[PDB]
Design a protein around this ligand. Structure first.
Ligand SMILES: Nc1ncnc2c1ncn2[C@@H]1O[C@H](COP(=O)(O)OP(=O)(O)O)[C@@H](O)[C@H]1O
Ligand SMILES: Nc1ncnc2c1ncn2[C@@H]1O[C@H](COP(=O)(O)OP(=O)(O)O)[C@@H](O)[C@H]1O
Ligand SMILES: Nc1ncnc2c1ncn2[C@@H]1O[C@H](COP(=O)(O)OP(=O)(O)O)[C@@H](O)[C@H]1O
Ligand code: BEF
Ligand code: BEF
Ligand code: BEF
Ligand SMILES: [Mg+2]
Ligand SMILES: [Mg+2]
Ligand SMILES: [Mg+2]
Lengths: 509, 523, 519
C-alpha cells in the first residue's frame, strides 16, 4: 500500500541500483550478449543496452524511471546507452550513505548534485578535442571506435564505410544547421545470406515489388520516373452517385465510360513521356495495357516512406491528380532500373550507377538484426560528430577526469554541501572500473594507477579493453562523440535528482 | 519457452554469491540493524514485540527483541547468534554486538565495491580487531579497587541500568547494589538474587529483603511466627506422612484386631514422627514435598509453621537464607542440619497474602530478594531484565580483575576510531583499506547516542572528534551544547564487557563474509 | 528472492507512537462516562454470553478483552489500582489516557519523546509530593474514629447502583472492616454471600458467620435448627461408615471372621462418632462428609450438623465462634471447640441458610446480599468491595484529601505555578500535565450536566486564589469546599493513581516500533 520514510528512499535506490546490475556486464569491449525472450515470440540476441532493457518489464517505479533513462539517451546520441544506466545508478547508490547515514536532507543533496553536474560538464568540454567532420579518415577511425564491443567488429572497417557512405549521402546542410535524417532517408534492407562484405550502400532504393505486366521493361537505361499518390483505376463519386437505367443500349454506354477514364489517366501520365511509373496505390489491368504500349514499366503499391525516398534519388516530385501532372515532375538523375531476382524473390533497383538504401547481408535473418542495430550505433555517432565536431577521451578517460577535478573541488568546498558533491566524483569512477573488471584486471590496482596518472600526467588516459592495462587514449585512440559524454552525465544526475525527491510511494489510480 | 539446467536434487533455492548475494544479505541485516540502532543508549526507545503465541513484550534490550522475533534470513540468524553469546556469556553489551557486527558489514560493502577480496576484507578486519583489543587493555582509565564496598558497586551498576531503564537509573542500581551486598561475604553467584514483583503503586515502593517471599500459605493454623530473634527451621525432600513402598503397598487385614487397631494405630505413629522433631526446637518446617493430613494436624498443635515449597530451585536458595539444610528422610534433624530465621510471617502485598523469610541482622543470608512494585506488568518485566543486566556485569567484575574500565558515552569509541586507523595507514598493502573501515565502523556507538538524543549528529560528531585530538573523557551529551564529559558523571562501560562484545561482533560479521553461497529447502 | 520474518506485520515511525496514543484514548473515552456522582453505567455482554452491569472501571476494562498492546496497558494500571488501593480504578485510566492525549501536540510539532517523558516525570514527582503535603492526617481533629470510615466509605459508594441506599450500606460497610482484627485487615475474612431475590438493601449483616447449607443428607429435619450458646465443633475430616475415601484389603478364612470384621467396622465408626458426642457439642461441622448414618445419629440426640462445608467457610467459622479445626476425634480438647450467641437455619430468599449470628468474640463476619437480579447483587458485591477496601486503607492511613475534583484541581495549581519558574520545553510539558489533571473535574461535570466550562473555570480562580479544597458542589451546581462538604478519599488513591497512570503514559511514549507476530 504505502511506504513513507527512508523505507521509500531505500527501495528506490536499491531498485535503481539493481537496474544497473543487469547490463553492467554489457559495457566494455568484451561485453556479453544478453539473449532476451520477447512475449510475441522471437528473440533478441543483442548486447546493445537499450535494446535489452526494452525487452524487460519492471515493477518498482524507480526501476521504471531508471529503465526509461536508457531510452531518452538512445534518442539524443545513438551510443552511450549502457553507460548512462550504470552511471545513473552509481550516482543514487553513492548518495545512499550521506542520504540517510549522514542524515542530509534530499533538498541539500540535490542542491549539490545539480551544482556538481555543471562543474563536471565543464571538465568534459575541457578535455574534449575538436575534429574534421569532413576528413574521411578521421570520421572512419571515429565511427570505428563505437563499433567495437559489438558482433559487427569482425568487419569494423567495412562498417564505418557503409556508415559514412550513408551519413553524408542523406545529409543536406541548409543555412539561412546541417540536418541528417538517417531515419526517413536511409531505409535499411536486411537480406538473408551471402557474406557480410557482400553488402553495399546503394545510392537509390530497393523494392522487391516486380513489374505490373509480363512483357514490360525489366530495366530502362535512363528511366523517366513518375511518382504518384492516386491509384490507377476507375474512380467513383464522393456523393450519392446512383445511376438509373431503362434506356436499353445505355448499359454498354456507361460500362464503356470506365475504360474511357482509365484511358485519359494513362494519357496524362504517358504525356510527359515516362518509362517508369511508380504509384503508391493500385493499377487497373486496363491502365497497365495503355501504359504498356504507352512505353513504360509500372510498379503498384509502394509505401509512402519507400516512395518519398525514391523522389529524392530520381528528383521526380510525387503528384496526385494527373490533369495537373507537370513536366517538371521529371525522372532525371536516376541510373538504371535493374530487377535482380534474389533467390526466388524479385527485386528492383534505382541506383544511379539525397537518400541511400543500406543493404546488409550476413548469415541469417537473426544475425542481421544484430548488424542493423550495431550499424545504427555507428551511423548515429557519425551524425553526432557531423553536428558537434568535438570528441572525448574514450576508454573511460573522460569519466575519470571529471572524477578528479570534482573530487579535488569537493574536498576544497567545506560544508555539509560537500558530501553529495564528493559522491558525484566517487560515482563517475565506476565506468573505468566496470571496464577494467569486464577486462579481467584488478580494479583497485589499475584504477589507483589510472587515477593517479590522471591526477597529473594527462587526462586522455583510459583503460584498454582486451588488454586490461591503463593506456593513454591519444596513443591507440578511442575517442567518442563529446555529445555522448554530455547526455550520459546530464540525465544520469537528473535521474538521481528526481528519485531523491521521493520520500513516499503510493498505490491506486 | 525458457529452458532450465543442471537440476537433479529436489526444489531448493541456491543463492550463489557470484550473484551479488553478499549484498542481498547485507540488506536483510541492514533491516534488523535499524531496529537495534534506536534501542541502544539512554535515549533508546522500546519496541513492543507480540509473541507467536500472543504475549506482549516491551524491551530496550537487543538480544531479547531478536529472541522474540521470527527471524529467517540465514545471514541474519548469524548475527542474532552473536546477540546470544553476549546475553549468555556476559548478560550485558548485547545491543552493541549488533550495531557493530552490522555496521561492520555495512562499511564492508564499500570495500567489496572497489574490488577487495572477501578473504582480504576478512583478514584486514581480524588484523584490525586483535589490534583493537590491545588498545582497550590500555585505553582503560580507572579500575574499581575491587572494593566490592557497597557504594563502589553503585558506581558500576548505575551506568548499566541507565540506557535500559533511564529515569530510575539510581533508584534501581541502588536497589540492587543493596541486594548483592547482603550476600557478598568478607574474604559470586548470580542466582542468589531472586527477584519478585507485584502490581501496585509505583517503583518508589520497591524493596530489598534478606530472604525470598513466597506466595502460598503456611498450611497449618500456624499463620505466622514470633518477633523474638532466632527460629529453628527444618527443610525436607521427603513428604510429611507415613512413607510408602515403591512396589505396591496395600494395607492387609486378617483379623478385626488388626483393623480396629490399625485405625488409631497409624494415628499416633504420625504423631510420633511429628512429635520427636518438634521437640528438637524446630518450629518452622518448609515442605518441598507433600504434606499428609494427620501430619499437619498434630504439628498444628505444636505451633509448627509449615510452608509447602515444591520449587526445588526455590527451596535450595531458601536454605541459603536461614542456614538450614535439606533433609532427605524424616526424623533425625541434627541440631546441625537446622537453620535460623529472624522473620517468617505473612504480609499482604498489593492486596494478596504472601509468606516471608527474612532476617534483620543475626544469621546473615546468602540469597536476597528484590521486591519490585509497579502498575504496568509489561514495564515491570523489562525492569527485571535490567536487574539481571546489572547483576550479570557485577558477577563479571570478579576474580580475574574485572574492575578495569574505560569511558562510556562512546568517548572510548571516538578515541578507538583514530587509534584503529593509526594502525590503518600504518600497515602496508591493500589491507590498509579494510583496517581503516573497521575503524569507521566504531562511529555507530557515538552517532546513534546523539541521533537518539535529538542532537544534530553532523554537529556532535565533528565536535566530539576535534575534542579528542589527557582528555579522552569527552563523550556524547545525552541531554544542550556540543558534547559532555564522562568524568562529569562517573559513567563508563567496563572493559570485560565492551571488549568481549567487539570480539563476538567481529566473528559474526566475519563468518557472514566467509559464506560465498547459500542453499535453503522448503520448510 | 529471500525474506526476514514470514509475513508478520510490524509498524514503525512517528505515526506508530501516535497510533498507540489514540488507541489508548479509545479504551479511555469508554470509561469517561462512568465517572462522578451522576455517572453513567455500562452493560457488557461478553462473547461468553454472561451479561454484566457495573461501574468498577476495572471490571469494565476487564470485560472489554482489548488486544492492542499500547491500549492494553490501560487495562493493567486499572487492575493494579483495584489492588494497592481498591478504588479510583475508573479514574486511573481517564488520567493515564488524558496525558497521552496532551502529548500529541509535542510529538506532532516534532519534539523528542524522551523530552516529553522527562517533563511528565518531574510533573508527577511534584504533584505526588503535593498530595502528601495536603494529606490531612487526623484522629480526633473533629473527625472521630467512625466518622472517618463512614464519611469516606460514603462518598466512594456514591455514583454506584448502591447509592440511594447509602446509609444502610456504609453503616454495613464500616461494621465489616471492623469485624476483623484492626491489626491485620484481611478481606478474605469478610466473606460475602449472595442470595437470589429480595430488595437491593434487604441484605443482612451477620455478626458471626453465615454459610450455604451443604447439608445434603437424610435424617436431617431432626436436629434442632436453633441454639443460643451451642458448643461448635470445627472438625476437619470425615464421618462416614465405609469412609468417604481410602481403603485396604481384608482377607479372612473364617466365617466368624467375616461377621467379626463387620461388627468391627461399625464399632470403628460409632466410637469416633460418640467421640464427637463426648465433646458435648450442639453443632458439628466438617469440611468433609457426614454420612446418612452419622447425621442420623446426632439427629437422634438433638445434635445438629452439616457435612462438606466450604473450605474458605470453616476458616471464617473458626474466627467466629473461636473454635479450632481438628483432624481426628481422639485428642479433642475443649479449648478447641467454639460457641456463638445464636444459631438458626433460615429460609432466606427460598434457600435454607445455616448461620451463627451474634459472636462478640469474632474476628470474621459474613454478609448476605440481596437483589432482584443476579446482575444487581453482583454489582453490589463489587460496589461494596470498592468501599470496604477504602475503609480498610483509611485505618492504616488516617491521611485524607477532598476529591470531587479539588485534590486534582489543586495539584494542577502548584504544578502550573511551578512551570513558570522553568520556562521552555519542560515548561509546556509540566504545564500540560497540570491541565491534563483537569479531566477529572471536567468530565465529572459533563457526566452530570453541570456547565463543564464555567464550573471548571470558576473553580480555577478561587482554588488557585486560595481555597485548597474547592471542588464541586454536587448539590447546588457550583464550586465549594469539598473538605467542608466532607467529600473525603484517602490520599493513598491519588498518589498511587498519578504514579501508576503516568507509568502507562511514558511506557507508550517510549515505544517507536510495534512488531506484531502472526501465528
Ligand atoms: N576499444 C575499447 N577499449 C577500451 N574502452 C572502450 C573500448 N571501446 C568502448 N570503450 C569504452 O566503453 C564505453 C563504451 O562501451 P559500449 O559497450 O559500447 O557501451 P555503450 O552501449 O554505452 O556504447 C565507453 O566508455 C568507451 O569509452
Ligand atoms: N549515562 C549515559 N550517558 C551516555 N552513554 C551511556 C550512558 N549510560 C550507558 N551509555 C551507553 O550505553 C551504550 C550501550 O547501550 P545499551 O543500551 O546500554 O546496550 P548494551 O549495554 O546492551 O550494549 C554504551 O556505549 C554506553 O556508552
Ligand atoms: N460525592 C461526590 N461529590 C463530588 N465528587 C465525588 C463524589 N463522590 C465521588 N466523587 C469523585 O468522583 C470520582 C470517582 O468516580 P467513580 O465513579 O466513583 O469511579 P472511581 O471512584 O472508581 O474512580 C473522583 O473524582 C471522586 O473524588
Ligand atoms: F553498446 Be552501445 F549501445 F553502443
Ligand atoms: F541492552 Be543491554 F544489555 F544494556
Ligand atoms: F468505580 Be470506582 F471503583 F469507584
Ligand atoms: Mg557504443
Ligand atoms: Mg547496558
Ligand atoms: Mg469510587
Amino acid at each position: 500500500e504505502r511506504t513513507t520514510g527512508r523505507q521509500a528512499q531505500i527501495s528506490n535506490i536499491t531498485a535503481a541500483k539493481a537496474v544497473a546490475d543487469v547490463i553492467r556486464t554489457c559495457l566494455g569491449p568484451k561485453a556479453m550478449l544478453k539473449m532476451l525472450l520477447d512475449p510475441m515470440g522471437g528473440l533478441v540476441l543483442t548486447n546493445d543496452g537499450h535494446a535489452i532493457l526494452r525487452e524487460i518489464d519492471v515493477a518498482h517505479p524507480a526501476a521504471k524511471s531508471m529503465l526509461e533513462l536508457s531510452r531518452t539517451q538512445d534518442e539524443e546520441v545513438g551510443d552511450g546507452t549502457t553507460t548512462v544506466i550504470i552511471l545513473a545508478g552509481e550516482i543514487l547508490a553513492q548518495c545512499a550513505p550521506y542520504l540517510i547515514e549522514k542524515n542530509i536532507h534530499p533538498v541539500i543533496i540535490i542542491q549539490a548534485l545539480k551544482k556538481a553536474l555543471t562543474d563536471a560538464l565543464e571538465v568534459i568540454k575541457q578535455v574534449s578535442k575538436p575534429v574534421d567532420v569532413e576528413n574521411d579518415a578521421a570520421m572512419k577511425k571515429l565511427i570505428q571506435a563505437s563499433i567495437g564491443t559489438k558482433y559487427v567488429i569482425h568487419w569494423s572497417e567495412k562498417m564505418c564505410e557503409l556508415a559514412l557512405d550513408a551519413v553524408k549521402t542523406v545529409r543536406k546542410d541548409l543555412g539561412q544547421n546541417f540536418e541528417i535524417d538517417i531515419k526517413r532517408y536511409v531505409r535499411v534492407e536486411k537480406i538473408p545470406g551471402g557474406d557480410v562484405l557482400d553488402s553495399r550502400v546503394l545510392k537509390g532504393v530497393l523494392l522487391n515489388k516486380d513489374v505490373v505486366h509480363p512483357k514490360m521493361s525489366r530495366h530502362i537505361e535512363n528511366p523517366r520516373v513518375v511518382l504518384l499518390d492516386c491509384p490507377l483505376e476507375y474512380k467513383k463519386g464522393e456523393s450519392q452517385t446512383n445511376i438509373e437505367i431503362e434506356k436499353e443500349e445505355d448499359w454498354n454506354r456507361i460500362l464503356q465510360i470506365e475504360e474511357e477514364q482509365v484511358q485519359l489517366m494513362c494519357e496524362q501520365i504517358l504525356a510527359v513521356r515516362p518509362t517508369l511509373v511508380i504509384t503508391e496505390k493500385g493499377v487497373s489491368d486496363l491502365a497497365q495495357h495503355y501504359l504498356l504500349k504507352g512505353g513504360c514499366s509500372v510498379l503498384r503499391r509502394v509505401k509512402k516512406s519507400d516512395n518519398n525516398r525514391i523522389a529524392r534519388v530520381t528528383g521526380a516530385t510525387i503528384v496526385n491528380r494527373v490533369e495537373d501532372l507537370k513536366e517538371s515532375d521529371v525522372g532525371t538523375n536516376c541510373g538504371l532500373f535493374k530487377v535482380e531476382m534474389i533467390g526466388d524473390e524479385y527485386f528492383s533497383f534505382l541506383d544511379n550507377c539525397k537518400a541511400c538504401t543500406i543493404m546488409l547481408r550476413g548469415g541469417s535473418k537473426d544475425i542481421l538484426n544484430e548488424i542493423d542495430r550495431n550499424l545504427q550505433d555507428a551511423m548515429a555517432v557519425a551524425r553526432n560528430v557531423m553536428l558537434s565536431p568535438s570528441l572525448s577521451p574514450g576508454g573511460g578517460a573522460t569519466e575519470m577526469a571529471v572524477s578528479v577535478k570534482l573530487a579535488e573541488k569537493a574536498k576544497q568546498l567545506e560544508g555539509i554541501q560537500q558530501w553529495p558533491y564528493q559522491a558525484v566524483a566517487d560515482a563517475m569512477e565506476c565506468i573505468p572500473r566496470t571496464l577494467i573488471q569486464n577486462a579481467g584486471g584488478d580494479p583497485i590496482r589499475l584504477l589507483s594507477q589510472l587515477r593517479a596518472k590522471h591526477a597529473q600526467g594527462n587526462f586522455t588516459t583510459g583503460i584498454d579493453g582486451d588488454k586490461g592495462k591503463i593506456v593513454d587514449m591519444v596513443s591507440y585512440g578511442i575517442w567518442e562523440p563529446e555529445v555522448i559524454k554530455q547526455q550520459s552525465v546530464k540525465t544520469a544526475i537528473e535521474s538521481a535528482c528526481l528519485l531523491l525527491r521521493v520520500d513516499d510511494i503510493v498505490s491506486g489510480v | 519457452q525458457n529452458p532450465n539446467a543442471g537440476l537433479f536434487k529436489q526444489g531448493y533455492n541456491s543463492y550463489s554469491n557470484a550473484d551479488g548475494q553478499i549484498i542481498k544479505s547485507i540488506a536483510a541485516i541492514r533491516e534488523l540493524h535499524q531496529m537495534c540502532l534506536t534501542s541502544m543508549g539512554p535515549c533508546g526507545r522500546n519496541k513492543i514485540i507480540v509473541n507467536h503465541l500472543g504475549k506482549i513484550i516491551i524491551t530496550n534490550d537487543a538480544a531479547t527483541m531478536l529472541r522474540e522475533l521470527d527471524i529467517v534470513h540465514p545471514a541474519v540468524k548469524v548475527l542474532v547468534m552473536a546477540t546470544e553469546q553476549q546475553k549468555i556469556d556476559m548478560g550485558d553489551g548485547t545491543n552493541l554486538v549488533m550495531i557493530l557486527a552490522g555496521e561492520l558489514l555495512n562499511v564492508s560493502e564499500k570495500l567489496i565495491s572497489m574490488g577487495l577480496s572477501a578473504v582480504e576484507i576478512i583478514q584486514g578486519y581480524n588484523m584490525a580487531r586483535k589490534f583493537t583489543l590491545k588498545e582497550l587493555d590500555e585505553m582503560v582509565v580507572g579500575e574499581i579497587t575491587d572494593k566490592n564496598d557497597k557504594n563502589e558497586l553503585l558506581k558500576m551498576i548505575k551506568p548499566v541500568i541507565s540506557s535500559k531503564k533511564y529515569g530510575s537509573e539510581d533508584i534501581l542500581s541502588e536497589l540492587v547494589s543493596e541486594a548483592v551486598s547482603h550476600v557478598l561475604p568478607v574474604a559470586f553467584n548470580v542466582d542468589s538474587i531472586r527477584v519478585v514483583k507485584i502490581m501496585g503503586g509505583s517503583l518508589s515502593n520497591s524493596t530489598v529483603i534478606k530472604g525470598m517471599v513466597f506466595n502460598r500459605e503456611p498450611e497449618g493454623h500456624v499463620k505466622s511466627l514470633s518477633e523474638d530473634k532466632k527460629h529453628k527451621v527444618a527443610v525436607f525432600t521427603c513428604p510429611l506422612d507415613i512413607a510408602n513402598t515403591e512396589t505396591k503397598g496395600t494395607v492387609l487385614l486378617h483379623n478385626a484386631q488388626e483393623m480396629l487397631d490399625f485405625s488409631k494405630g497409624e494415628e499416633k505413629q504420625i504423631d510420633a514422627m511429628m512429635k520427636e522433631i518438634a521437640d528438637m526446637g524446630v518450629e518452622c518446617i518448609v515442605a518441598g514435598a507433600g504434606v499428609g493430613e494427620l501430619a499437619l494436624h498434630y504439628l498444628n498443635r505444636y505451633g509448627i509453621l509449615v510452608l509447602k515449597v515444591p520449587s526445588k530451585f526455590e527451596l535450595r536458595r531458601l536454605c541459603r537464607v536461614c542456614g538450614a539444610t535439606p533433609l532427605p528422610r524424616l526424623g533425625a534433624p541434627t541440631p546441625e542440619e537446622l537453620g535460623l530465621v529472624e522473620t517468617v510471617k505473612t504480609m499482604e502485598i498489593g492486596g494478596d497474602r504472601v509468606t516471608v523469610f527474612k532476617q534483620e541482622q543475626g544469621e546473615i543470608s546468602r540469597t536476597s530478594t528484590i521486591i519490585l512494585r509497579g502498575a504496568t506488568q509489561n514495564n515491570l518485566d523489562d525492569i527485571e531484565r535490567a536487574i539481571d543486566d546489572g547483576v550479570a556485569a557485577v558477577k563479571g567484575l570478579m576474580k580475574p580483575s574485572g574492575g578495569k574500565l574505560l569511558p562510556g558515552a562512546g568517548a572510548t569509541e571516538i578515541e578507538l576510531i583514530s587509534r584503529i586507523t593509526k594502525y590503518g595507514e600504518r600497515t602496508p598493502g591493500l589491507l590498509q583499506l579494510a583496517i581503516k573501515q573497521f575503524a569507521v565502523a566504531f562511529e555507530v556507538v557515538p552517532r546513534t547516542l546523539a541521533e537518539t538524543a535529538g542532537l544534530d549528529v553532523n554537529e556532535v560528531l565533528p565536535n566530539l572528534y576535534a575534542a579528542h585530538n589527557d582528555h579522552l573523557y569527552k563523550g556524547v551529551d545525552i541531554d544542550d551544547e556540543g558534547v559532555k564529559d564522562i568524568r562529569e558523571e562517573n559513567i563508563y562501560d567496563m572493559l570485560a564487557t565492551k571488549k568481549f562484545a567487539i570480539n563476538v561482533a567481529t566473528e559474526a560479521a566475519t563468518t557472514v563474509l566467509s559464506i560465498d553461497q547459500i542453499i535453503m529447502a522448503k520448510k | 528472492i529471500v525474506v526476514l520474518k514470514e509475513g508478520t506485520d510490524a509498524s514503525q515511525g512517528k505515526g506508530q507512537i501516535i497510533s498507540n496514543i489514540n488507541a489508548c484514548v479509545a479504551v479511555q473515552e469508554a470509561l469517561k462516562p462512568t465517572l462522578g456522582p451522576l455517572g453513567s453505567d455500562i452493560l457488557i455482554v461478553t462473547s461468553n454470553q454472561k451479561t454484566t452491569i457495573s461501574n468498577d472501571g476495572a471490571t469494565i476494562l476487564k470485560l472489554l478483552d482489548v488486544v492492542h498492546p499500547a491500549a492494553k496497558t490501560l487495562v493493567d494500571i486499572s487492575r493494579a489500582q483495584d489492588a494497592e488501593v481498591g478504588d479510583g480504578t475508573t479514574s486511573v485510566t481517564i488520567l493515564a489516557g488524558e496525558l497521552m492525549k496532551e502529548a500529541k501536540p509535542f510529538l506532532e510539532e516534532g519534539i523528542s519523546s524522551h523530552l516529553i517523558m522527562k517533563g511528565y516525570r518531574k510533573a508527577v514527582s511534584l504533584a505526588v509530593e503535593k498530595i502528601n503535603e495536603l494529606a490531612v492526617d487526623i484522629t480526633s481533629e473533629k473527625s472521630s474514629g467512625r466518622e472517618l470510615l463512614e464519611r469516606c466509605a460514603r462518598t466512594a459508594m456514591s455514583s454506584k447502583l448502591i447509592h440511594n441506599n447509602a446509609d444502610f450500606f456504609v453503616k454495613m460497610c464500616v461494621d465489616a472492616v471492623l469485624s476483623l482484627d484492626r491489626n491485620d485487615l484481611d478481606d478474605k475474612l469478610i466473606g460475602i454471600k449472595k442470595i437470589p431475590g429480595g430488595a437491593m438493601e434487604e441484605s443482612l449483616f451477620i455478626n458471626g458467620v453465615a454459610f450455604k447449607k451443604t447439608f445434603s443428607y437424610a435424617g436431617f429435619e431432626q436436629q434442632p435448627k436453633k441454639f443460643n450458646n451451642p458448643k461448635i465443633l470445627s472438625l476437619n475430616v470425615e464421618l462416614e461408615l465405609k469412609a468417604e475415601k481410602d481403603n485396604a484389603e481384608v482377607r479372612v478364612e473364617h466365617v466368624e471372621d467375616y461377621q467379626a470384621i463387620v461388627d468391627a467396622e461399625w464399632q470403628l465408626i460409632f466410637e469416633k462418632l460418640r467421640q464427637v458426642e463426648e465433646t458435648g457439642a450442639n453443632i458439628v461441622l466438617s469440611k468433609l462428609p457426614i454420612g446418612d448414618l452419622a447425621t442420623q445419629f446426632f439427629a437422634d440426640r438433638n445434635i445438629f450438623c452439616a457435612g462438606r462445608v466450604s473450605a474458605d467457610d470453616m476458616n471464617r467459622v473458626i474466627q467466629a465462634v473461636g473454635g479450632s479445626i481438628q483432624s481426628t476425634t481422639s485428642d479433642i480438647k475443649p479449648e478447641h471447640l467454639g460457641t456463638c450467641a445464636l444459631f438458626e437455619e433460615m429460609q432466606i430468599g427460598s434457600e435454607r441458610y445455616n448461620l451463627f449470628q451474634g459472636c462478640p468474640q469474632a474476628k470474621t463476619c459474613t454478609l448476605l446480599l440481596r437483589g432482584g437480579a443476579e446482575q444487581v447483587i453482583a454489582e453490589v458485591e463489587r460496589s461494596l468491595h470498592d468501599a470496604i477496601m477504602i475503609v480498610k486503607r483509611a485505618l492504616q492511613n488516617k491521611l485524607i484529601v477532598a476529591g470531587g475534583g479539588a485534590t486534582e484541581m489543586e495539584v494542577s495549581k502548584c504544578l502550573r505555578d511551578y512551570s513558570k519558574t522553568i520556562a521552555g520545553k519542560q515548561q509546556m510539558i509540566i504545564n500540560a500535565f497540570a491541565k491534563a489533571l483537569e479531566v477529572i473535574p471536567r468530565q465529572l461535570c459533563e457526566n452530570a450536566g453541570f456547565d463543564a466550562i464555567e464550573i471548571l473555570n470558576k473553580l480555577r480562580l478561587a482554588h488557585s486564589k486560595g481555597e485548597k479544597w474547592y471542588g464541586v458542589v454536587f448539590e447546588t451546581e457550583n464550586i465549594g469546599d469539598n473538605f467542608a462538604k466532607f467529600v473525603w478519599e484517602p490520599a493513598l488513591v491519588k498518589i498511587n493513581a498519578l504514579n501508576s497512570a503516568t507509568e502507562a503514559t511514558n511506557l507508550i511514549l517510549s515505544v517507536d516500533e510495534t512488531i506484531t507476530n502472526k501465528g
